Amino acid sequence: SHMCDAFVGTWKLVSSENFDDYMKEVGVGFATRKVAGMAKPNMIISVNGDVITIKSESTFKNTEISFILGQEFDEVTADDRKVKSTITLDGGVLVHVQKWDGKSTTIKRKREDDKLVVECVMKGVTSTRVYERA
Ligand SMILES: O=C(O)[C@H]1CCCC[C@H]1COc1cccc(C(F)(F)F)c1
Numbered sequence: 001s002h003m004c005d006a007f008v009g010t011w012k013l014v015s016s017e018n019f020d021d022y023m024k025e026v027g028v029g030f031a032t033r034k035v036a037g038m039a040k041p042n043m044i045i046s047v048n049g050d051v052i053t054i055k056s057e058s059t060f061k062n063t064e065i066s067f068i069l070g071q072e073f074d075e076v077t078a079d080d081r082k083v084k085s086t087i088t089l090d091g092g093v094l095v096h097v098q099k100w101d102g103k104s105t106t107i108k109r110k111r112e113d114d115k116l117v118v119e120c121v122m123k124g125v126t127s128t129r130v131y132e133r134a
Helices: 019-026 030-038
Strands: 009-017 042-048 051-057 062-067 073-076 082-090 093-100 103-112 115-122 125-133
Touching: 019 030, 019 115, 019 125, 062 073, 062 082
Parallel strands: none
Antiparallel strands: 009 042, 009 125, 042 051, 051 062, 073 082, 082 093, 093 103, 103 115, 115 125
């Protein structure tokens, strides 16, 4: 057993707060905000050795990242940013920093009761996205 055991599984979005304002702060344009904001993604998290994979599937886009903790990688986000990402574990929280165009956003993923809670921060703006097991 290991590092991210409690994250592994298939998860479905059950609530979102302040996501439009997060996306605005990130620089996402109107039509992508509207369509992406409707989506109810499924997130599939798996671990194989040191490699963590996070897959997201939705009506809008499917995304997938695979990574080693602490090791920077290139990521294409769902809104089509080309970013440089580093993901670490800090006190049981997955902390994901994305850098692009001199900007930065941080996404935290944590287990809270039977939920997986995702907090997305861009400058002073936070969005909270709650997932439950599928
Ligand atoms: O909810 C989350 O896990 C977060 C993760 C960080 C970025 C924001 C949000 C992902 O937001 C979206 C919104 C629409 C569709 C998709 C995807 F299925 F294409 F991945 C993803």
